[PDB]
Design a protein around this ligand. Structure first.
Ligand SMILES: Nc1nc2c(ncn2[C@@H]2O[C@H](COP(=O)(O)OP(=O)(O)OP(=O)(O)O)[C@@H](O)[C@H]2O)c(=O)[nH]1
Ligand SMILES: Nc1ncnc2c1ncn2[C@@H]1O[C@H](COP(=O)(O)OP(=O)(O)CP(=O)(O)O)[C@@H](O)[C@H]1O
Ligand SMILES: Nc1nc2c(ncn2[C@@H]2O[C@H](COP(=O)(O)OP(=O)(O)O)[C@@H](O)[C@H]2O)c(=O)[nH]1
Ligand SMILES: [Ca+2]
Ligand SMILES: [Ca+2]
Ligand SMILES: [Ca+2]
Ligand SMILES: [Mg+2]
Ligand SMILES: [Mg+2]
Lengths: 436, 335, 54, 427
């Protein structure tokens, strides 16, 4: 057994963190007081769930996770929430005042004073690991902490844990729920800095989750609670292989091996189905697999038809057998536009977990008998980079808000250096994806 | 109050469309880079499709189908027809794609069919230049630089009388956001004013029926353009048949086949933005009244006489259909 | 068309279907960055306090 | 807990300041005694931002009252909520400032300023995490304008890394006390451009016009004008006083509203406009949205159609459909996209609070960074220059040791500010 440490940074990372760990407990039969009746090896063991949970002599299963925020408000709700007994205070790190949606403030000013404390708390979790795989880092693009401190943390993690893998769950900014106008700045700045330190990053566009919650859950005005419970389902689908018995993606390095042929292009598109309202009073393997190629079900709105695939993974949960999947794939292949790059094989890696997806009791999501999350590395996700870089260019041409960043000790040149790196990234997708 | 932006000032069609929108009083034009639009009259090249459909509270529509270039590029059209199971047809002339020596490629395949012609003593005239020698053609391609397409030159075309004139048929096709295919009932024939010559292919003036090349001009019909009512009457007088039976049935068939083929690739049925597009199909008719597709134009102009009616039709079924304001000129090719 | 590497267990199973074959900065440098930014902040604050003193 | 330290200086500053504390005390369920008697838990969630706590669950405003004469502060102490203020936080002189910026800034005010800073310091040292200061004052008088800006400079010297925010009342000939008001205002604007992060420009011209035309008050008093001010101040501080995601603190607000350091002067707006006259018919969300953007509801006497919006913050209060709020807010931006700069994407942010102000089931407060605010500064600049070119009334200032060059510099800087707004209006 090999352990995975989760790191939740800033408001988005923390609130999504709670959604995920709440879901994990429901999936593994772990009570809010840390007890797990089905675990017979008391106070120890090396089961698949032990990748995420350590054990105390009193039979308490605690998350291998650290929560860090430069403001105490959000994590204080974890300290007094329903799952307060789950974590110990050392795991929950809070600062005094936040980064005010300023990358420079989160990275340089405030990051410098708290980075050693964070690393030390992480070191304590790592010292309890017989074989650490690496880290799963949850954060937003648009927040000052989520962007600025994460990038600093990822740099320091590469130094302290060179051999370990690092996976990202990143929240891409959307105006419908955004709380800052400079989020494109923060997004580009943190992507530039974290790029060489991240092995695989799963971007989640709040716009996509927002519209799915409206369209499929009939929620007029989705809240963070709505968004995060949907996000945690996708995250759970991706990490289920690390927490349950299986043979596909049972290790962090396997994500890179299966989804990331070229290091810089490490942003797989996630697509999930089905999303059914709980108030509404069952789709087949063929139907939910077909939905994986509908832009309306993707975590990032883009058009894979006008791009190329480098790799594709299908993660099923529930009543699914290989025969159904192959028949479904055969039908879809002759029905849709699925172009792979020439230097890669046209195929799918499939993983099935017989346990159907677990939903939060009294939530918006209905219990389904089978679901699927498709992870595909497609060049079409570069559309999200293009949108973001354009908004960057609009403001930066006038140097709008730049003084806030320079005021925190950041140099103006970092803006252009970060933007140039993104321009190179867009070019990389162009070369891989387009013919001429 | 609906809003739109203009990013192609060189479009004669949509300059008229944007004019009509303003006349309704319910449409307002914005600056080029204003993102808060309902409608985008986009640019011919590098249209930022990736930035469309991400403005909350806005239904956004664009006048181009992303991926339609597959049909509208000569090199792409040949590839499409050959490699698509639905298309690989009898209505498309024998074609091959050729890359220059200094610039995969089917050159040995083109020469393979060239042999049957010469060693069969039949028609071996091809067009890129219109020469009967493959050497004179290939030496021309390598000298230019760009990628050219080699296609069989239809040596036996239908000829208009009097004058022994060669012509081509232009059809305008509008495809809306629901992927309804609308054929404008008014087409046009681009005619050659010089008599068709069988011997000398050096004189490309009579062979090429482009309006610019033609401009004997305006002797027979005004602007070297014959319309459908006149051409139908000609077919009734000369060949005892109608335009609908002998030609239009084939035309409607070809348009359906081409557009239905690429539909799953370009449809915006479940996209975060919607597309429509005006197409210009160019046809060739042989002496046996058989219709051949020559090419598809993605950004076609219209006949001066037909601008008012066509552009209004674009507003009614493509724009107002998505944005309703406070018999038909099109033929709906159903599917 | 071809299913390969089928692995089965009680929790589920996994496999691969192929449709068609193919045709860092040190700790010192980081600290140097953070310190460089800190000093730039210190410089700007010093200029302000100098200005206010005037 | 991000504490704010409130400061009110001069006659105007103390009168709108008192009214402000009166209004938000009622919203937070605080009686004049200082005891809580509200019903909602949301009232006490972020009450530490403006109130300190004493044993016996007493809530004392983190407010400091300053004047160079005891008159107005005597009236405050006799006012409805006069007993709620900490008696130690009353800092006053006897000489007055005679509507003279130089007296407030250089002579009379310089003698009293250390006493004020002693109280400021004591309040800051009791803060778990001070986020910054808010100052209420007029720019047309002597104490609020002159000593107020002196205070700001000295506070910035001691707390350089904190946010400085002001509610600044701009003078108007329509509602004027002395003819030297354009002098005092120009001298003050010079200070505010360099030493504040956020300034709500509250124009007495606009306040008068709203009372006269819209509110149908034949002859409005300062009390009538201040009714609008306190309502506006309640609105713009709503996101600070109640739990929320958008602009929940002073620095996040500044980061969202200020693209360029000098351009931090905001046009406030409020709907529905009410007279100190109860309303029975609650406005629909489209009505709130339409009126809050209307020039007749602006507090700066500037026509926003004469300029462009750099950034906009909107706050809706009361129980309403957030879906309809989003739809109406997007509708305004889509219909009038020509008035929003395209080089700042998504520059309009909206917040919703469940707790409505007293007397209303719902309301909307508008905060705009518009280039049309240059009309306010151009108005002052012309009034300034009309007198200064003849050096009229200058002896009041040179008599306090000021030189003409200081006036010239202040005028030059404000003119620069005007051209900077025009620059980004044509960008
Ligand atoms: N899906 C989701 N997105 C969130 C959540 N909280 C914030 N966001 C998004 O993240 C961005 C805001 O960044 P935050 O994470 O709140 O900022 P932060 O990391 O706390 O950094 P500070 O600036 O120091 O507060 C916006 O785009 C929000 O829409 C959440 O719970 N769920
Ligand atoms: N195989 C063929 N047989 C007979 N004529 C042909 C032919 N291929 C092309 N032509 C002639 O060439 C003329 C125009 O060629 P084509 O339309 O391919 O060039 P083009 O695409 O640059 C003009 P446009 O795209 O604007 O319509 C037609 O009028 C047609 O008569
Ligand atoms: N809105 C409002 N404006 C005021 C009030 N009192 C004075 N003013 C304005 O403030 C300016 C006079 O400054 P004042 O505050 O009286 O002088 P100070 O006491 O020396 O600061 C003039 O422009 C007045 O119109 C008030 O209660 N409300
Ligand atoms: Ca165990
Ligand atoms: Ca004295
Ligand atoms: Ca002292
Ligand atoms: Mg935060
Ligand atoms: Mg007075």
């Amino acid at each position: 057994m090999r352990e995975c440490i989760s790191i939740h940074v800033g408001q988005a990372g923390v609130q999504i963190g709670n959604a995920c760990w709440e879901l994990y407990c429901l999936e593994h039969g772990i009570q809010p007081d840390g007890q797990m009746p089905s675990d017979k090896t008391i106070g120890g063991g090396d089961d698949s769930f032990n990748t995420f949970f350590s054990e105390t002599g009193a039979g308490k299963h605690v998350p291998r996770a650290v929560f860090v925020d430069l403001e105490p408000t959000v994590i204080d709700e974890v300290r007094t929430g329903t799952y307060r007994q789950l974590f110990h205070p050392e795991q929950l790190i809070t600062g005094k005042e936040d980064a005010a949606n300023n990358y420079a403030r989160g990275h340089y000013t405030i990051g410098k004073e708290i980075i050693d404390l964070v690393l030390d708390r992480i070191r304590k979790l790592a010292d309890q690991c017989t074989g650490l795989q690496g880290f799963l880092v949850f954060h937003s693009f648009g927040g000052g902490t989520g962007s600025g401190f994460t990038s600093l943390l990822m740099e320091r993690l590469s130094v302290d844990y060179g051999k370990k893998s690092k996976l990202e769950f990143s929240i891409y900014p959307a105006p419908q729920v955004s709380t800052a106008v400079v989020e494109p700045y923060n997004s580009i700045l943190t992507t530039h800095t974290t790029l060489e330190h991240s092995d695989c990053a799963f971007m989640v566009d709040n716009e996509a989750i927002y519209d799915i919650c409206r369209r499929n859950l009939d929620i007029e005005r989705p809240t963070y609670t709505n968004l995060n419970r949907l996000i945690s389902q996708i995250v759970s689908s991706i990490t289920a292989s690390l927490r349950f018995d299986g043979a596909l993606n049972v290790d962090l390095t396997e994500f890179q091996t299966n989804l990331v042929p070229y290091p810089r292009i490490h942003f797989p598109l996630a697509t999930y189905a089905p999303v059914i309202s709980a108030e509404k009073a069952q789709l087949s393997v063929a139907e939910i697999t077909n939905a994986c190629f509908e832009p309306a079900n993707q975590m990032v709105k883009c058009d894979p038809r006008h791009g190329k695939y480098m790799a594709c993974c299908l993660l099923y949960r529930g009543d699914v057998v290989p025969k159904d999947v192959n028949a479904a794939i055969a039908t879809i292949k002759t029905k849709r536009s699925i172009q792979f790059v020439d230097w890669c094989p046209t195929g799918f890696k499939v993983g099935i977990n017989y346990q159907p997806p677990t939903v939060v009791p009294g939530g918006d999501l209905a219990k389904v008998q089978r679901a699927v999350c498709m992870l595909s590395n497609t060049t079409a996700i570069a559309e999200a980079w293009a949108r973001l870089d354009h908004k960057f260019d609009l403001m930066y041409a006038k140097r709008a808000f730049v003084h806030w960043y320079v005021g925190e000790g950041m140099e103006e040149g970092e803006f252009s250096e970060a933007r140039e790196d993104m321009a190179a990234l867009e070019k990389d997708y162009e070369e891989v994806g387009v013919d001429s | 109050m609906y809003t739109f932006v203009v990013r192609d000032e060189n479009s004669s069609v949509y300059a008229e469309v944007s004019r009509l929108l303003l006349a309704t009083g319910q449409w307002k034009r914005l600056r080029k880079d204003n993102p808060r639009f309902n409608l985008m009259l986009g640019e011919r090249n590098r249209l930022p499709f990736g930035r469309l459909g991400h403005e909350p509270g806005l239904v956004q529509l664009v006048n181009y189908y992303r991926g339609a270039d597959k049909l509208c590029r000569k090199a792409s059209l040949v590839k499409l027809i050959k490699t698509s199971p639905e298309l690989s047809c009898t209505w498309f002339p024998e074609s091959y794609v050729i890359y220059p020596t200094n610039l995969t490629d089917e050159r040995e395949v083109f020469l393979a069919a060239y042999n049957r012609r010469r060693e069969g003593r039949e028609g071996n005239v091809w067009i890129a230049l219109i020469s009967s020698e493959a050497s004179e053609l290939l030496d021309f391609i390598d000298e230019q630089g760009q990628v050219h397409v080699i296609q069989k030159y239809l040596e036996k075309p239908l000829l208009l009388e009097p004058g022994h004139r060669k012509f081509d048929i232009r059809s305008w096709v509008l495809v809306d956001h629901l992927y309804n295919i609308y054929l404008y009932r008014e087409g046009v024939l681009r005619t050659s004013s010089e008599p068709y010559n069988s011997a000398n292919f050096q004189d490309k003036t009579c062979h090429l029926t482009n309006h610019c090349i033609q401009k004997n001009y305006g002797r027979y019909e005004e602007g070297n353009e014959m319309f459908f009512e006149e051409f139908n009457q000609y077919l009734m007088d000369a060949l005892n048949t109608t335009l609908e039976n002998s030609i239009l049935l084939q035309i409607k068939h070809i348009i359906r086949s081409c557009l239905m083929c690429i539909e799953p690739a370009i449809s915006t049925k479940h996209l975060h933005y919607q597309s429509f597009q005006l197409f210009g199909f160019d046809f060739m008719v042989d002496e046996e009244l058989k219709v051949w597709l020559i090419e598809v134009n993605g950004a076609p102009a219209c006949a001066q006489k037909l601008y008012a009616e066509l552009c209004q039709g674009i507003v009614d079924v493509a724009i107002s259909s998505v944005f309703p304001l406070a018999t038909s000129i099109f033929i709906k090719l159903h599917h | 068309m071809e299913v390969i590497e089928l692995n089965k267990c009680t929790s589920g199973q996994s496999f691969e279907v192929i449709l068609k074959p193919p045709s860092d900065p040190s700790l010192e440098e980081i600290q140097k960055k953070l310190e460089a930014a800190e000093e730039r902040r210190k410089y700007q604050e010093a200029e302000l306090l100098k200005h206010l003193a005037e | 807990m991000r504490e704010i330290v409130h400061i009110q200086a001069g006659q105007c500053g103390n009168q709108i300041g008192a009214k402000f504390w009166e209004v938000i005390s009622d919203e937070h369920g605080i009686d004049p005694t200082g005891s809580y008697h509200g019903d909602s838990d949301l009232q006490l969630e972020r009450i530490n931002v403006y109130y300190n706590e004493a044993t016996g669950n007493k809530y004392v405003p983190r407010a400091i009252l300053v004047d160079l004469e005891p008159g107005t502060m005597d009236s405050v102490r006799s006012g409805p909520f006069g007993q709620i203020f900490r008696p130690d936080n009353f800092v006053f002189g006897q000489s007055g400032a005679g509507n003279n910026w130089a007296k407030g800034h250089y002579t009379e005010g310089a003698e009293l300023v250390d006493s004020v800073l002693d109280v400021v310091r004591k309040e800051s040292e009791s803060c778990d995490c001070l986020q910054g200061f808010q100052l209420t004052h007029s720019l047309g008088g002597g104490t609020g304008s002159g000593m107020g800006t002196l205070l700001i400079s000295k506070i910035r010297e001691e707390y350089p890394d904190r946010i400085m925010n002001t509610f600044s009342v701009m003078p108007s000939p329509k509602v004027s006390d002395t003819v030297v008001e354009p002098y005092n205002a120009t001298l003050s604007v010079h200070q505010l451009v360099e030493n504040t992060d956020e300034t709500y420009c509250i124009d007495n011209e606009a306040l008068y016009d709203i009372c006269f035309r819209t509110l149908k008050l034949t002859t409005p008093t300062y009390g009538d004008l201040n009714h609008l001010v306190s309502a506006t101040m309640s609105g713009v501080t709503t996101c600070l006083r109640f739990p929320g995601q958008l602009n929940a603190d002073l620095r996040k607000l500044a980061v969202n509203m200020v693209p360029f350091p000098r351009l931090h002067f905001f046009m406030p707006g409020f709907a529905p406009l009410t007279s100190r006259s109860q309303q029975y018919r609650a406005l629909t969300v489209p009505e709130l949205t339409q009126q809050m953007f209307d020039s007749k509801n602006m507090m700066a006497a500037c026509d926003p159609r004469h300029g462009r919006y750099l950034t906009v913050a909107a706050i809706f209060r009361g129980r309403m459909s957030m879906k309809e709020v989003d739809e109406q807010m997007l509708n305004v931006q889509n219909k009038n996209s020509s008035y929003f700069v395209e080089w700042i994407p998504n520059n309009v942010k909206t917040a919703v609070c469940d707790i409505p102000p007293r007397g209303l089931k719902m309301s909307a407060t508008f905060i705009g960074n518009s280039t049309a605010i240059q009309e306010l500064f151009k108005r002052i600049s012309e009034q300034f220059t009309a007198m200064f070119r003849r050096k009229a009334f200058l002896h009041w200032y040179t008599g306090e040791g000021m030189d003409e060059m200081e006036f010239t510099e202040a005028e030059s800087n404000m003119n620069d500010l005007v051209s900077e707004y025009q620059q980004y209006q044509d960008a």
